[PDB]
Amino acid sequence: MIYSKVFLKLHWGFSVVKPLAKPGFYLPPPTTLIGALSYGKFRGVDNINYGSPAYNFRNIMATARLESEGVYTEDTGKVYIPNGRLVVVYVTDSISKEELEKLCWSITRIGCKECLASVENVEVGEAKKVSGRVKTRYYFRDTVKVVGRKEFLEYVTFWEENGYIWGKEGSPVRYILPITTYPLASKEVEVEAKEAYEVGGEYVVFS
RNA sequence: AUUGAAAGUUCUGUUUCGAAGAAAACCCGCCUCAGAUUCAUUAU
């Protein structure tokens, strides 16, 4: 199981609108993170035999977190965090280290066209699996238990990869975000969980 | 190539017209630079 870390510098922020008034999300879903990675190999093509040129990277695990302060504003929901930093962790085993590292440098935007994001540095390595009590900052699933004080937790709804095809709605999956609503920031939460990969001290929780 | 893809809330407008900081008023009334000093002794 290989892991990779990437540091992104945002220009003005990201904007993803909720499916089904056009409110937006607080943090990008894993689908956008996988699509950004897939952009490095499928550049120039928009329809493959027809739902998306991204129904092939569906089994790559990804998480992301903030490192600065921002504000969520509806004026079409947007998340303004200019000059901020984003840390993205990719965990997978489908491809070797070289291919993941090459695709990691080829990220251009997160969400829509205006949400450009440069790349500052990357790291590649081998991860280890643990199950003891850990502290994490990345968001995880709803079914994961919590031992600490419930004070900085929010509930969101994301979709599986089934939504990659047009004319079809993805399955609804609940997610828990360790985020402060105003101002926008990230906080640490202690979880027990069953599977956690150590990617450099900042344990990533998946189930 | 990501609930992503496709879009300007943009077009037309004077804070403008007028009204003296003006009139009267002394820096003027007394004071001294004052007393002492050889250019002469020698040259057809």
**A117 and A9 Cβ atoms separated by less than 8 Å:** yes
How far is residue A205's CA from residue A175's CA, in Å, rounded to a whole number? 12
How far is residue A177's CA from residue A26's CA, in Å, rounded to a whole number? 9
- Tokens 């205006």 locate to A114
**A4 and A104 Cβ atoms separated by less than 8 Å:** yes
How far is residue A207's CA from residue A81's CA, in Å, rounded to a whole number? 29
Q: What is residue A40's three-state secondary structure?
A: coil
Q: How many helices (H) and strands (E) does chain A have?
A: 2, 17
**A171 and A159 Cβ atoms separated by less than 8 Å:** yes
- Give nucleotides in strand B with any atom < 7 A to a protein C-beta: 1-6
How far is residue A71's CA from residue A58's CA, in Å, rounded to a whole number? 31
Q: What is the resolution of this structure in A?
A: 3.5
CA atoms within 13 A on the CB side of A10: 25
What is the distance in angstroms between the CA of the first residue and the CA of the last residue of chain A? 16
How far is residue A115's CA from residue A105's CA, in Å, rounded to a whole number? 17
C-beta neighbour count of A85 within 10 angstroms: 15
- Tokens 């897939």 locate to A38
**A111 and A13 Cβ atoms separated by less than 8 Å:** no
**A100 and A124 Cβ atoms separated by less than 8 Å:** yes
**A65 and A87 Cβ atoms separated by less than 8 Å:** yes
Nucleotide nearest A18, from its CA to each C1': B3
**B29 C1' to A46 CA distance, Å:** 111
Identify the experimental approach: cryo-EM
Q: What angle do CA A145, A147, A152 make, to 5 degrees?
A: 90
**B9 C1' to A74 CA distance, Å:** 17
Nucleotide nearest A24, from its CA to each C1': B3
Tokens found for residue A66: 């903030």
Nucleotide nearest A14, from its CA to each C1': B2
